[PDB]
Design a protein around this ligand. Structure first.
Ligand code: HEM
Length: 293
């Protein structure tokens, strides 16, 4: 059946220990600001948290964030993961300073820290992921393709136990960063800010004038005169009438999008993990700004 992965708290560690890790990540995000033409490492860390969680299969509980298996070559060389090496490199000195944190805890915490420092919603986070051996590394091909339609997106996300609202909310993370032709065969940002977490993805889908064009890798993407782009999968959220209603909702309610994204993102990062009844409550980390740091 399904594998069982029980959360086990890094020995003797508590909220204060993880806040220190959060702070080191946040401080380095501030420090290494030049990355990717001054976008900074925020977006790639969010993508790293999603990709290391998104291999999960609810049917048998393979993949998922628990095992921290991205550290192994099969997964880091996944063509779907091209570019994430930048996120992993960023995290190296963090892991060196705090060698006690598990890899899955670090990859997932990198995502939480990035969202929050980029002025996104608070994302409650739980510790206790435990490194698993190389033979537990899921095969390539569990991450989604971008050249597909709404039916594909809907079916894909059923494997991660996500419903329509959860899918649309999670996709709003595409406010962040950009596609890079050398990584994915798509080129351009989804919006203007790209290192500030807002509902701009939805506003842009609805409000820009989009043209279906071919990029330099001979792949179709939707382009706007403002210099933004949408993947076929992004654009499918306004082609499908059920997705469209939810896009409109998030475009018109920043708080609702924040609340829903926080729930879906924590869920994504926790899928596959069994938390003991007496496990600590989820942690809500203070930002550097809230700490006066
Ligand atoms: C249908 C599902 C999805 C597809 C097909 C997809 C596809 C892509 C592609 C092709 C890129 C560009 C990679 C590159 O060239 O560097 C990208 C970037 C990104 N994705 Fe997604 N994605 C999906 C869902 C998600 C989800 C659920 C999240 C998180 C909640 C996410 C977060 C990000 C972020 C933050 C970036 C920017 C990374 C950077 O700037 O380096 N994506 N995605």
């Amino acid at each position: 059946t399904p594998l069982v992965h029980v959360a086990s708290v890094e020995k003797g560690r508590s909220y204060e220990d993880f806040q220190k890790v959060y702070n080191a990540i946040a401080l380095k995000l501030r420090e290494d600001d030049e990355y990717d033409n001054y976008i900074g490492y925020g977006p790639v860390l969010v993508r790293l948290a999603w990709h290391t969680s998104g291999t999960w299969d609810k049917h048998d509980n393979t993949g998922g964030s628990y095992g921290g298996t991205y550290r192994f070559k099969k997964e880091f060389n996944d063509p779907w993961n091209a570019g994430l090496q930048n996120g992993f490199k960023f995290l190296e000195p963090i892991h060196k300073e705090f060698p006690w944190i598990s890899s899955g805890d670090l990859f997932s915490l990198g995502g939480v820290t990035a969202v929050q420092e980029m002025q996104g919603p608070k994302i409650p986070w739980r510790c206790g992921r435990v490194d698993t051996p190389e033979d537990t590394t899921p095969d390539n091909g569990r991450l989604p393709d971008a050249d597909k339609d709404a039916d594909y997106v809907r079916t894909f996300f059923q494997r991660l136990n996500m419903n329509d609202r959860e899918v649309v909310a999670l996709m709003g993370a595409h406010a962040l960063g950009k596609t890079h032709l050398k990584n994915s065969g798509y080129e351009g940002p989804w919006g203007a800010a790209n290192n500030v977490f807002t509902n701009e993805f939805y506003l842009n889908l609805l409000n820009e004038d989009w043209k279906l064009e071919k990029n330099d890798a001979n792949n179709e993407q939707w382009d706007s005169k403002s210099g933004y782009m949408m993947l076929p999968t992004d654009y499918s959220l306004i082609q499908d009438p059920k997705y469209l209603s939810i896009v409109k909702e998030y475009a018109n309610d920043q708080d609702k999008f924040f609340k829903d994204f926080s729930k879906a993102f924590e869920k994504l990062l926790e899928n596959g993990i069994t938390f003991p009844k007496d496990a600590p409550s989820p942690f809500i980390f203070k930002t550097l700004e809230e700490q006066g740091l």
